Amino acid sequence: MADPSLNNPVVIQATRLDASILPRNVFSKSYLLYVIAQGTDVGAIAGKANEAGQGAYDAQVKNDEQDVELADHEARIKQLRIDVDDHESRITANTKAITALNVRVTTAEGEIASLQTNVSALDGRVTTAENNISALQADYVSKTATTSQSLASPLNVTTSYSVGGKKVVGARQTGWTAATGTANKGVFDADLTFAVSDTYTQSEIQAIANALITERRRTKAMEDALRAHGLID
Amino acid sequence: MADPSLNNPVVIQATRLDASILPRNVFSKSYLLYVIAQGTDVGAIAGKANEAGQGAYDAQVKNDEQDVELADHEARIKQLRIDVDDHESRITANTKAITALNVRVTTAEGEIASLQTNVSALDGRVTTAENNISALQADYVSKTATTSQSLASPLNVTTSYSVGGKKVVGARQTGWTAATGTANKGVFDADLTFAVSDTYTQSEIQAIANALITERRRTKAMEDALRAHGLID
Amino acid sequence: MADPSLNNPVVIQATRLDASILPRNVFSKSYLLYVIAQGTDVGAIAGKANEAGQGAYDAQVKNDEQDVELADHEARIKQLRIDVDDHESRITANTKAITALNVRVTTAEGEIASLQTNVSALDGRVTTAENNISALQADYVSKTATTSQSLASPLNVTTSYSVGGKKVVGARQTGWTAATGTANKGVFDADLTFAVSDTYTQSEIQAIANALITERRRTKAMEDALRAHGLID
């Protein structure tokens, strides 16, 4: 746009005369004022067409520079839409990420919990474990112990008990008929008091049998002693 | 800004023409018409020029309108650019951070995974420990325990067996010559082997020898009792 | 919109003034040139008025386009603004969620580390126990075992020893006496007899009080074997 010629005025004859250059005696008083006005009229008119043309050039000049800004406006709205668009995709891309992480922390809070609850059970179960093992180590009767280790119960074995690889006690000895009589308790020597007489006429003889009794009564002592244990009956 | 004069029309200060005012018999015929033709010509050009200012004054009015809205456009476009650039920086931070969350969420998922395994493996080892710990308690001797405990096996001890704090059995007594004959363990009692006389009497001496043989047969019986077990050679 | 009648040109109908048609015996030369200079100026103003009309036209046609374009620009600006304010809320919400998940995450991490401490520790007490019970396994006397068990201690028991569930050893039998003399574990005759006749016979008698002597001696042996075990006092 912007047409330069529109700004170029028409020049009109400067002359704005009168009865100086007018006839003398020919036309009406009124034609006089007319011709005269006629001249003023043409003049005011040429100035309108010049203002208009002026006015017109100016409105096209505004046009060319408003055009540059519309054009600039399109560029920035264009670039903003492209940015807005981009953004929309990313904000969405970020919101879906917050949510996807939400479920993972969530599930992983339930897991850490049942972790805490299960480590807990593991602890008291391992405590009474130690406790029980401790009990075991206080009284189990051991196979390497050098020292005597007693127990406050009775003991039953299987075949037999031994000492130093040799056996010394087996199952009970049956078939017995207990001895009756008094048991021998005290003084007793296996070395021969008694004996005789040679030919005799002094009887005694009692001596042999007196001792023989004390031999059976002491036998009723040993025998008895073993039965009370249980070695026999 | 729209110039107000453009819309102001050239007030044609001069009445119509109409021949009656014209100098007749002085003017040529051709001038007569020229003066007429020039007549409406000055009106039509006025009109035309007045409407030319008209259109341009309108093109300016709109030009004013369009500039207030272009300025408006201008200011809101600037605004959006400023916020959208604010948005870009927030957006870009928000995803970097969520990328940053992710790495420690993974680092934690990875370790929780680790802990569930080891705790699972922990249960495993603990169950098995309780179990052979309950086998142990159910099959060991234990010092303290008042109810008699049977072994289900033969025993073997190192220098002896004691009861209530006293030795009762040892290694087996060695170097016995086994006896001979046939031992029996029927009835035996504190016999009146005696009944002696003033004179001798064979029947009564014999009773002595008779109770003597049972005696010895009674001690070999015994002797068989203690070797059978093992207390003796 | 653009007034198209802006372009309609006025055509002057006054013919170019030939001076021969003017009344030169009555017209000063002054108003002869004036008169000539008026027609001329009038056609020219015709062209200037015309020009500023087709010019105001182009400005008005351009106003028309620019108008279209404007409203489009409004429209999009108007929508951009809607999409930004939406983003505004969403973004601020996402930032809020991100930091809220970070306290979530950070607390989560202390718990994982508190656990880790407690599970490694668990590992250790299981390892120890696992070893402590394995050591029991190898050294405990079995209540169930079939193959014989040896003890490398002396054994003390409460109240008695039994084999096959039968009492066999108990208290050591006290208030006893130690038979004095020479104990014989030597050769013991196969329950020999003796020989008894009519009259006395000294050899007939010495024989029995002889077998009497050894009878006791061997007895005494038995009693000694018993004390060195501890079955009797």
XYZ file of C-alpha atoms in Angstrom:
699
model
C 0.000 0.000 0.000
C 0.752 3.668 0.543
C 0.263 5.449 -2.842
C 2.385 8.618 -2.804
C 0.336 10.459 -5.447
C -2.605 10.562 -3.055
C -0.566 13.039 -0.988
C 0.052 15.345 -3.960
C -2.374 18.268 -4.100
C -3.859 19.824 -7.207
C -2.696 23.395 -7.549
C -5.284 25.926 -8.629
C -4.894 29.444 -10.000
C -4.120 31.728 -7.050
C -6.180 34.456 -8.666
C -9.227 35.417 -6.615
C -10.255 38.601 -8.279
C -13.095 40.988 -8.613
C -14.493 44.012 -10.412
C -10.846 44.779 -10.994
C -10.831 42.365 -13.914
C -14.608 42.137 -14.385
C -16.564 43.715 -17.251
C -18.549 46.870 -16.603
C -22.130 46.811 -17.874
C -23.408 43.448 -19.060
C -24.617 40.861 -16.571
C -26.855 40.745 -13.508
C -25.817 41.922 -10.065
C -26.588 38.338 -9.111
C -24.379 36.846 -11.846
C -21.716 39.130 -10.385
C -21.975 37.557 -6.966
C -22.195 34.156 -8.638
C -19.027 34.399 -10.754
C -17.293 35.766 -7.681
C -18.614 32.989 -5.439
C -17.935 30.572 -8.285
C -14.275 31.460 -7.807
C -14.458 30.984 -4.050
C -16.394 27.733 -4.567
C -13.806 26.171 -6.913
C -11.199 27.148 -4.361
C -12.889 25.583 -1.333
C -13.574 22.485 -3.438
C -10.034 21.869 -4.668
C -8.997 21.925 -0.999
C -11.530 19.272 -0.059
C -10.318 16.910 -2.794
C -6.831 17.623 -1.493
C -7.784 17.002 2.123
C -9.524 13.802 1.076
C -6.514 12.588 -0.915
C -4.375 13.485 2.081
C -6.767 11.736 4.466
C -6.686 8.722 2.164
C -2.892 8.482 1.990
C -2.745 8.576 5.773
C -5.298 5.754 6.198
C -3.235 3.473 3.941
C -0.090 4.260 5.920
C -1.770 3.223 9.122
C -2.816 0.139 7.119
C 0.715 -0.905 6.123
C 2.016 -0.659 9.699
C -1.094 -2.322 11.228
C -0.359 -5.112 8.734
C 3.135 -5.595 10.125
C 1.647 -6.040 13.573
C -1.146 -8.361 12.568
C 1.552 -10.404 10.858
C 3.715 -10.273 13.973
C 0.592 -11.092 16.011
C -0.052 -14.249 13.971
C 3.540 -15.371 14.458
C 3.381 -15.101 18.243
C -0.109 -16.630 18.529
C 1.146 -19.419 16.274
C 4.216 -20.039 18.424
C 2.112 -19.850 21.602
C -0.340 -22.515 20.400
C 2.593 -24.818 19.582
C 3.962 -24.177 23.083
C 0.570 -24.537 24.727
C -0.010 -27.798 22.875
C 3.424 -29.141 23.890
C 2.706 -28.188 27.496
C -0.643 -30.005 27.512
C 1.061 -33.233 26.530
C 3.742 -32.822 29.217
C 1.426 -31.840 32.059
C -0.582 -34.945 31.302
C 2.710 -36.844 30.998
C 3.637 -35.562 34.468
C 0.250 -36.258 36.053
C 0.247 -39.874 34.857
C 3.725 -40.198 36.310
C 2.709 -38.878 39.749
C -0.117 -41.442 39.752
C 2.035 -44.354 38.528
C 4.505 -43.561 41.278
C 1.608 -43.230 43.733
C 0.682 -46.891 43.345
C 4.301 -48.016 43.663
C 4.916 -46.134 46.953
C 1.482 -47.280 48.044
C 2.018 -50.965 47.427
C 5.528 -50.541 48.896
C 4.077 -49.108 52.096
C 1.931 -52.221 52.575
C 5.007 -54.348 51.887
C 7.276 -52.519 54.347
C 4.542 -52.896 56.991
C 4.193 -56.639 56.634
C 7.974 -56.601 56.564
C 8.015 -54.881 59.971
C 5.367 -57.238 61.272
C 7.236 -60.350 60.054
C 10.695 -59.327 61.222
C 8.944 -58.823 64.570
C 7.615 -62.398 64.676
C 11.054 -63.603 63.587
C 12.571 -61.948 66.665
C 10.477 -63.491 69.459
C 10.542 -66.782 67.655
C 14.334 -66.622 67.624
C 14.347 -65.535 71.287
C 12.516 -68.556 72.664
C 14.806 -70.495 70.304
C 17.912 -69.259 72.117
C 16.093 -69.679 75.422
C 15.286 -73.322 74.626
C 18.829 -73.999 73.382
C 20.084 -72.452 76.630
C 17.946 -74.882 78.621
C 19.261 -77.800 76.621
C 22.861 -76.771 77.330
C 22.217 -76.660 81.109
C 21.178 -80.303 81.573
C 21.502 -82.727 78.680
C 23.888 -85.372 79.982
C 26.853 -85.295 77.581
C 29.068 -87.915 75.952
C 32.372 -86.024 76.234
C 32.060 -84.665 79.775
C 34.918 -85.853 81.937
C 33.179 -84.891 85.130
C 30.168 -86.559 86.746
C 26.936 -84.975 85.749
C 24.264 -86.633 88.002
C 20.507 -86.684 87.425
C 17.582 -86.657 89.854
C 15.666 -89.382 88.028
C 15.828 -93.155 87.798
C 17.566 -94.628 84.742
C 16.549 -97.573 82.592
C 18.850 -98.788 79.914
C 18.469 -101.562 77.371
C 20.653 -104.576 77.298
C 23.029 -103.725 80.030
C 25.180 -101.065 81.593
C 28.963 -101.100 81.243
C 32.108 -99.515 82.611
C 35.372 -99.200 80.688
C 34.048 -101.310 77.837
C 33.445 -104.303 80.118
C 29.848 -105.109 81.066
C 28.959 -105.368 84.735
C 25.165 -105.406 84.952
C 22.668 -107.348 82.853
C 18.967 -108.198 83.172
C 17.720 -109.653 86.433
C 18.707 -113.174 87.493
C 15.592 -115.321 87.784
C 14.871 -118.864 88.944
C 15.487 -118.013 92.560
C 13.758 -119.148 95.743
C 14.665 -116.618 98.483
C 16.496 -117.893 101.553
C 14.678 -117.791 104.874
C 16.404 -117.202 108.222
C 18.300 -114.547 110.116
C 20.960 -112.569 108.297
C 24.537 -112.413 109.551
C 25.428 -108.828 110.403
C 28.768 -108.504 112.140
C 32.116 -110.136 112.933
C 33.258 -112.853 110.550
C 36.620 -114.398 109.710
C 37.288 -116.981 107.021
C 40.375 -118.241 108.900
C 39.553 -121.427 110.639
C 38.977 -121.548 114.337
C 37.601 -125.126 114.802
C 38.889 -128.501 113.894
C 38.727 -131.734 115.797
C 39.426 -134.133 118.193
C 42.043 -136.696 117.198
C 40.520 -139.880 118.571
C 38.039 -137.905 120.747
C 36.170 -138.712 124.004
C 35.652 -134.848 124.169
C 32.806 -134.403 121.814
C 32.667 -130.832 121.025
C 31.916 -131.230 117.214
C 29.388 -128.330 117.639
C 32.127 -125.963 116.396
C 32.011 -127.326 112.850
C 28.248 -126.884 112.595
C 28.079 -123.681 114.663
C 30.284 -122.086 112.013
C 28.466 -123.856 109.164
C 25.332 -122.023 110.319
C 26.986 -118.589 110.352
C 28.187 -119.462 106.849
C 24.611 -119.849 105.591
C 23.265 -116.956 107.626
C 25.927 -114.727 106.118
C 25.012 -116.303 102.810
C 21.483 -115.206 103.574
C 23.062 -111.776 104.047
C 24.849 -111.503 100.712
C 22.034 -113.179 98.781
C 19.438 -110.928 100.409
C 21.574 -107.848 99.676
C 21.583 -108.712 95.977
C 17.883 -109.402 95.831
C 17.132 -106.034 97.427
C 19.163 -104.354 94.712
C 17.466 -106.462 92.041
C 20.519 -108.384 90.694
C 18.411 -111.424 91.492
C 14.567 -111.399 91.786
C -6.705 9.640 15.006
C -9.513 10.334 12.551
C -9.418 13.957 11.467
C -12.797 15.601 12.057
C -12.547 17.925 9.046
C -12.602 15.087 6.464
C -16.211 14.518 7.486
C -16.968 18.247 7.241
C -18.236 18.977 3.708
C -17.262 22.040 1.668
C -20.205 24.384 2.262
C -20.744 25.617 -1.292
C -21.365 29.283 -0.559
C -23.247 30.106 -3.813
C -26.825 29.614 -5.093
C -27.855 27.691 -8.211
C -27.184 29.054 -11.694
C -30.347 29.310 -13.867
C -30.065 31.217 -17.198
C -32.222 34.230 -16.209
C -29.199 35.687 -14.416
C -27.070 35.194 -17.545
C -26.080 38.120 -19.774
C -28.179 37.480 -22.858
C -27.229 38.812 -26.281
C -23.707 39.372 -24.943
C -22.542 35.776 -24.587
C -21.986 33.322 -27.417
C -24.358 30.366 -27.697
C -21.423 28.056 -26.941
C -20.447 30.117 -23.916
C -24.120 29.985 -22.826
C -23.966 26.224 -22.538
C -20.409 26.058 -21.302
C -21.447 28.358 -18.494
C -24.218 25.837 -17.810
C -22.191 22.633 -18.236
C -19.454 24.104 -16.034
C -22.321 24.708 -13.605
C -23.363 21.204 -12.657
C -19.695 20.237 -13.051
C -18.690 22.320 -10.045
C -21.483 20.696 -8.056
C -20.666 17.120 -9.070
C -17.023 17.677 -8.205
C -17.984 19.141 -4.841
C -20.204 16.183 -4.116
C -17.519 13.806 -5.323
C -14.815 15.533 -3.269
C -17.078 15.682 -0.205
C -17.681 11.909 -0.377
C -13.982 11.242 -0.978
C -13.332 12.921 2.347
C -16.255 10.862 3.538
C -14.716 7.469 2.702
C -11.336 8.452 4.101
C -12.784 9.694 7.372
C -14.465 6.301 7.677
C -11.271 4.428 6.818
C -9.651 6.424 9.633
C -12.445 5.816 12.173
C -12.071 2.059 11.630
C -8.309 2.581 11.731
C -8.745 3.967 15.297
C -10.969 1.054 16.372
C -8.505 -1.456 14.942
C -5.616 0.154 16.806
C -7.309 -0.032 20.202
C -7.957 -3.749 19.600
C -4.472 -4.332 18.222
C -3.088 -2.766 21.398
C -5.429 -5.003 23.383
C -4.220 -8.004 21.374
C -0.633 -6.849 21.952
C -0.988 -6.751 25.740
C -2.725 -10.134 26.094
C -0.234 -11.853 23.828
C 2.619 -10.483 25.905
C 0.862 -11.742 29.033
C 0.425 -15.315 27.780
C 4.086 -15.474 26.691
C 5.182 -14.465 30.163
C 2.993 -17.080 31.882
C 3.700 -19.835 29.341
C 7.394 -19.247 29.922
C 6.647 -19.419 33.637
C 4.821 -22.681 32.947
C 7.725 -24.088 30.960
C 10.088 -23.663 33.900
C 7.596 -25.197 36.303
C 6.813 -28.071 33.962
C 10.497 -28.749 33.372
C 11.150 -28.818 37.124
C 8.191 -31.076 37.881
C 9.392 -33.841 35.532
C 13.030 -33.679 36.578
C 11.903 -34.105 40.175
C 9.543 -36.984 39.391
C 12.475 -38.536 37.476
C 14.373 -38.100 40.740
C 11.670 -39.729 42.852
C 11.698 -42.676 40.485
C 15.330 -43.420 41.051
C 14.824 -43.639 44.815
C 11.557 -45.492 44.391
C 13.416 -48.093 42.318
C 16.334 -48.162 44.755
C 13.740 -48.913 47.435
C 11.709 -51.437 45.438
C 14.978 -53.234 44.802
C 15.869 -53.365 48.470
C 12.402 -54.291 49.717
C 12.617 -57.150 47.203
C 15.910 -58.076 48.881
C 14.337 -58.014 52.350
C 11.343 -60.189 51.465
C 13.738 -62.815 50.089
C 16.014 -62.820 53.143
C 13.049 -62.787 55.495
C 11.541 -65.683 53.605
C 14.878 -67.448 53.871
C 14.873 -66.449 57.558
C 11.546 -68.163 58.261
C 12.965 -71.235 56.574
C 15.983 -71.468 58.889
C 13.965 -70.717 62.033
C 11.252 -73.265 61.342
C 13.980 -75.894 60.920
C 15.664 -74.759 64.131
C 12.473 -74.892 66.213
C 11.889 -78.332 64.705
C 15.163 -80.012 65.550
C 15.021 -78.022 68.769
C 11.760 -79.862 69.589
C 13.337 -83.144 68.569
C 16.193 -82.457 70.940
C 13.977 -81.740 73.953
C 12.013 -84.888 73.097
C 14.966 -87.287 73.148
C 17.791 -86.142 75.461
C 18.678 -87.365 78.974
C 18.633 -84.190 81.057
C 20.036 -84.116 84.585
C 17.072 -82.389 86.194
C 13.984 -84.480 85.448
C 12.284 -86.479 88.209
C 10.507 -89.123 86.112
C 12.722 -92.137 85.293
C 14.274 -92.100 81.838
C 14.814 -95.320 79.900
C 17.576 -95.189 77.262
C 16.390 -97.731 74.653
C 20.065 -98.656 74.250
C 22.892 -100.233 76.218
C 24.977 -97.850 78.329
C 28.704 -97.385 78.963
C 30.234 -95.221 81.718
C 33.847 -94.414 82.534
C 34.898 -95.312 86.101
C 31.622 -96.242 87.765
C 27.920 -95.883 88.475
C 26.653 -94.022 91.590
C 23.317 -93.814 93.385
C 22.278 -90.968 95.694
C 25.927 -89.880 95.794
C 27.623 -93.220 96.352
C 29.488 -95.595 94.029
C 27.641 -98.856 93.505
C 29.441 -100.457 90.545
C 32.952 -100.370 89.085
C 35.169 -102.090 86.607
C 34.651 -105.823 86.931
C 36.615 -107.545 89.687
C 39.208 -109.694 87.897
C 40.986 -112.985 88.400
C 38.366 -115.380 89.737
C 38.640 -119.098 89.147
C 35.127 -120.193 88.167
C 33.744 -122.922 90.435
C 32.314 -126.281 89.313
C 29.349 -128.608 89.909
C 25.702 -127.704 89.456
C 24.294 -124.781 91.418
C 20.623 -124.556 92.400
C 18.484 -121.844 93.986
C 15.528 -123.566 95.547
C 14.561 -123.486 99.240
C 17.251 -122.738 101.830
C 16.917 -121.827 105.512
C 18.610 -121.357 108.905
C 18.530 -125.117 109.431
C 18.936 -126.943 112.724
C 22.043 -128.628 111.298
C 22.977 -129.074 114.936
C 21.262 -131.662 117.184
C 24.538 -133.121 118.506
C 25.088 -136.014 120.921
C 26.993 -137.242 123.929
C 27.768 -140.051 121.585
C 28.632 -139.251 118.013
C 25.777 -140.412 115.712
C 26.486 -140.817 112.000
C 22.991 -139.631 110.988
C 23.663 -136.219 112.512
C 27.208 -135.737 111.171
C 25.756 -136.445 107.727
C 23.127 -133.738 108.125
C 26.027 -131.327 108.555
C 27.726 -132.490 105.365
C 24.380 -132.357 103.604
C 23.746 -128.733 104.531
C 27.343 -128.054 103.667
C 26.951 -129.252 100.083
C 23.805 -127.201 99.574
C 25.712 -124.219 100.966
C 28.567 -124.394 98.476
C 26.087 -125.112 95.697
C 24.319 -121.940 96.879
C 27.451 -119.763 96.673
C 28.374 -121.000 93.207
C 24.821 -120.175 92.166
C 25.529 -116.734 93.485
C 28.869 -116.718 91.699
C 27.073 -117.543 88.450
C 24.778 -114.605 89.192
C 27.606 -112.027 89.258
C 29.615 -113.263 86.269
C 26.440 -113.546 84.157
C 25.837 -109.846 84.853
C 29.564 -109.142 84.710
C 30.406 -107.923 88.219
C 32.875 -110.780 88.449
C 35.631 -112.329 86.340
C -17.805 -2.782 4.353
C -15.888 -0.929 1.625
C -18.170 1.449 -0.275
C -17.692 0.474 -3.931
C -19.370 3.635 -5.193
C -16.222 5.384 -3.920
C -14.702 4.478 -7.292
C -17.416 5.987 -9.550
C -15.719 8.889 -11.366
C -17.370 12.193 -12.184
C -16.957 12.996 -15.906
C -16.998 16.705 -16.649
C -19.363 17.449 -19.507
C -18.140 20.998 -20.147
C -16.163 21.022 -23.360
C -12.670 22.498 -23.343
C -13.031 26.265 -23.723
C -12.084 27.439 -27.180
C -11.167 31.108 -26.881
C -13.016 31.855 -30.118
C -16.291 31.160 -28.305
C -15.475 33.691 -25.564
C -16.697 37.322 -25.975
C -13.323 39.015 -26.367
C -14.587 42.449 -27.233
C -16.237 42.418 -23.804
C -13.820 40.336 -21.743
C -10.693 41.906 -20.280
C -7.635 39.783 -21.113
C -7.330 39.404 -17.377
C -10.684 37.661 -16.927
C -9.994 35.777 -20.179
C -7.074 33.871 -18.646
C -8.875 33.557 -15.342
C -11.836 31.975 -17.189
C -9.473 29.669 -19.066
C -7.634 28.778 -15.858
C -10.938 27.886 -14.200
C -12.120 25.192 -16.622
C -8.642 23.636 -16.493
C -8.537 23.671 -12.687
C -12.019 22.232 -12.646
C -11.144 19.149 -14.679
C -8.022 18.661 -12.575
C -9.988 18.865 -9.349
C -12.196 16.228 -10.970
C -9.235 13.880 -11.139
C -8.097 14.654 -7.606
C -11.529 14.130 -6.143
C -11.739 10.955 -8.236
C -8.338 9.695 -7.078
C -9.013 10.284 -3.389
C -12.167 8.228 -3.887
C -10.566 5.153 -5.393
C -7.890 5.663 -2.725
C -10.304 5.762 0.197
C -11.718 2.669 -1.420
C -8.451 0.695 -1.227
C -8.118 1.733 2.391
C -11.633 0.487 3.149
C -11.181 -2.784 1.294
C -8.035 -3.301 3.345
C -9.889 -2.368 6.539
C -12.251 -5.187 5.571
C -9.542 -7.915 5.473
C -7.771 -6.640 8.579
C -11.143 -6.845 10.283
C -11.505 -10.563 9.466
C -7.971 -11.287 10.642
C -8.503 -9.389 13.885
C -11.500 -11.434 15.020
C -9.587 -14.649 14.297
C -6.726 -13.380 16.438
C -9.191 -12.565 19.272
C -10.742 -15.982 18.946
C -7.359 -17.767 19.300
C -6.041 -15.422 21.943
C -9.295 -16.102 23.737
C -8.668 -19.876 23.584
C -4.986 -19.727 24.450
C -5.991 -17.934 27.658
C -8.442 -20.678 28.434
C -5.825 -23.361 27.910
C -3.276 -21.506 30.062
C -5.462 -21.062 33.145
C -6.298 -24.746 32.899
C -2.600 -25.540 32.864
C -2.129 -23.105 35.734
C -4.215 -25.162 38.159
C -2.964 -28.568 36.938
C 0.718 -27.675 37.175
C 0.359 -26.275 40.708
C -1.411 -29.476 41.654
C 1.308 -31.681 40.214
C 3.992 -29.789 42.123
C 1.984 -30.310 45.299
C 1.710 -34.029 44.671
C 5.425 -34.416 43.928
C 6.542 -32.924 47.221
C 3.806 -34.799 49.094
C 5.182 -38.084 47.700
C 8.645 -37.092 48.806
C 7.857 -37.020 52.501
C 6.177 -40.372 51.828
C 9.329 -41.633 50.169
C 11.802 -40.235 52.708
C 9.968 -41.736 55.672
C 9.735 -45.044 53.779
C 13.533 -45.074 53.432
C 14.225 -44.780 57.149
C 11.923 -47.721 57.738
C 13.693 -49.817 55.098
C 16.998 -48.995 56.797
C 15.638 -49.775 60.282
C 14.534 -53.156 58.998
C 17.843 -53.924 57.264
C 19.566 -53.456 60.585
C 17.152 -55.817 62.291
C 17.288 -58.503 59.589
C 21.064 -58.684 59.371
C 21.100 -58.971 63.141
C 18.531 -61.762 62.774
C 20.857 -63.567 60.393
C 23.486 -63.658 63.139
C 21.363 -65.041 65.970
C 20.117 -67.686 63.590
C 23.646 -68.668 62.565
C 24.771 -68.965 66.223
C 21.735 -70.990 67.254
C 22.075 -73.117 64.121
C 25.616 -73.828 65.281
C 24.695 -74.168 68.948
C 22.134 -76.896 68.227
C 24.318 -78.728 65.739
C 26.840 -78.980 68.619
C 24.079 -80.440 70.787
C 23.070 -82.952 68.102
C 26.529 -84.519 68.275
C 26.970 -84.722 72.046
C 23.591 -85.600 73.540
C 22.775 -89.047 74.851
C 19.724 -90.221 72.854
C 16.673 -91.450 74.708
C 15.702 -93.327 71.507
C 18.995 -94.625 69.987
C 19.375 -98.350 69.263
C 23.179 -98.562 69.130
C 24.960 -98.355 72.449
C 26.080 -95.082 74.015
C 29.275 -94.477 75.932
C 29.845 -91.917 78.696
C 33.237 -90.584 79.553
C 32.197 -89.371 82.966
C 31.122 -91.319 85.961
C 27.334 -91.461 86.189
C 25.307 -90.681 89.343
C 21.588 -91.463 89.394
C 18.604 -90.946 91.636
C 17.194 -94.027 93.362
C 18.186 -96.864 90.980
C 19.352 -98.431 87.724
C 17.153 -100.691 85.577
C 17.596 -102.810 82.430
C 14.636 -103.830 80.255
C 12.543 -101.731 82.640
C 13.419 -103.929 85.656
C 15.042 -102.556 88.842
C 18.592 -103.965 89.179
C 20.702 -101.567 91.276
C 19.597 -99.236 94.074
C 20.883 -98.107 97.476
C 24.208 -99.679 98.451
C 22.928 -101.781 101.410
C 24.586 -100.379 104.521
C 25.381 -101.287 108.135
C 27.529 -104.127 106.816
C 30.662 -105.812 108.115
C 33.879 -106.753 106.294
C 34.619 -110.475 106.566
C 38.200 -110.873 107.685
C 40.646 -113.468 106.397
C 42.033 -114.774 103.119
C 39.439 -114.689 100.339
C 39.618 -117.470 97.763
C 38.468 -116.951 94.176
C 40.505 -120.083 93.494
C 39.328 -123.548 92.427
C 35.999 -124.738 93.852
C 35.251 -128.491 93.792
C 32.407 -129.665 91.572
C 30.040 -129.912 94.564
C 32.102 -132.846 95.806
C 30.827 -135.279 98.368
C 32.591 -136.351 101.535
C 32.198 -139.996 102.636
C 30.543 -141.053 105.933
C 30.989 -144.432 107.590
C 30.093 -146.379 110.724
C 32.491 -145.099 113.368
C 34.222 -141.718 113.825
C 36.973 -141.618 111.200
C 39.041 -138.491 111.799
C 39.810 -138.027 108.087
C 36.082 -138.338 107.492
C 35.710 -135.315 109.725
C 38.712 -133.156 108.809
C 37.491 -133.363 105.223
C 34.254 -131.490 105.976
C 35.712 -128.907 108.354
C 38.263 -128.473 105.570
C 35.700 -127.850 102.861
C 34.024 -125.713 105.493
C 37.090 -123.428 105.700
C 37.324 -122.804 101.952
C 33.538 -122.387 101.787
C 33.786 -119.312 104.017
C 36.928 -118.014 102.298
C 35.256 -117.990 98.885
C 32.257 -116.439 100.617
C 34.496 -113.685 101.901
C 35.768 -113.160 98.350
C 32.188 -112.599 97.159
C 31.637 -110.108 99.992
C 34.836 -108.296 99.050
C 34.034 -108.109 95.359
C 30.753 -106.559 96.488
C 32.314 -103.853 98.654
C 34.847 -102.761 96.053
C 31.908 -102.212 93.784
C 29.790 -100.478 96.416
C 26.744 -102.757 96.337
C 27.223 -103.311 100.074
C 28.779 -101.423 102.977
